[PDB]
Structure 1
Amino acid sequence: PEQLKHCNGILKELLSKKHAAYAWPFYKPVDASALGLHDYHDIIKHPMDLSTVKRKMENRDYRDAQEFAADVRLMFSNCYKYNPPDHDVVAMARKLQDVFEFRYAKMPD
Structure 2
Amino acid sequence: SMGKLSEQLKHCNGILKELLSKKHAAYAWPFYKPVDASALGLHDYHDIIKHPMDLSTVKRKMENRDYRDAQEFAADVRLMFSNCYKYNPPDHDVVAMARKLQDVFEFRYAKMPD
TM-score tier, shorter chain, comes to: over 0.9
Structure 1 residue 61: Cα displacement: 1.0
Runs of 4+ in 1 over 6 A off after TM superposition: none
Number of residues of Structure 1 aligned to a counterpart in Structure 2: 108
SS at match of 2:23: helix
Structure 1 residue 60: Cα displacement: 1.3
Q: TM-score, normalised by structure 1?
A: 0.98
Deviation digits for residues 71-106 of structure 1 (CA, Å, limit 9, x no counterpart): 000000000000010100000000000000000000
Deviation digits for residues 12-45 of structure 1 (CA, Å, limit 9, x no counterpart): 0000000000000000000100100100000000
Q: Name the CA distance, whole Å, in 1 between partners of 2:14 and 2:57.
A: 16
> Aligned residue for 1:65?
70
Deviation digits for residues 42-69 of structure 1 (CA, Å, limit 9, x no counterpart): 0000000000000011111111001000
Q: Name the CA distance, whole Å, in 1 between partners of 2:97 and 2:64.
A: 28
Q: Name the CA distance, whole Å, in 1 between partners of 2:60 and 2:43.
A: 27
Counterparts of 1:21-100 in structure 2 under 5 Å? 21-100=26-105
Q: Name the CA distance, whole Å, in 2 between partners of 1:16 and 1:58.
A: 17
Q: Name the CA distance, whole Å, in 1 between partners of 2:15 and 2:51.
A: 22
SS at match of 2:91: coil
| Identical counterparts, % of pairs | 100
Q: TM-score, normalised by structure 2?
A: 0.93
Q: Name the CA distance, whole Å, in 2 between partners of 1:88 and 1:27.
A: 16
CA-atom RMSD, angstroms? 0.5
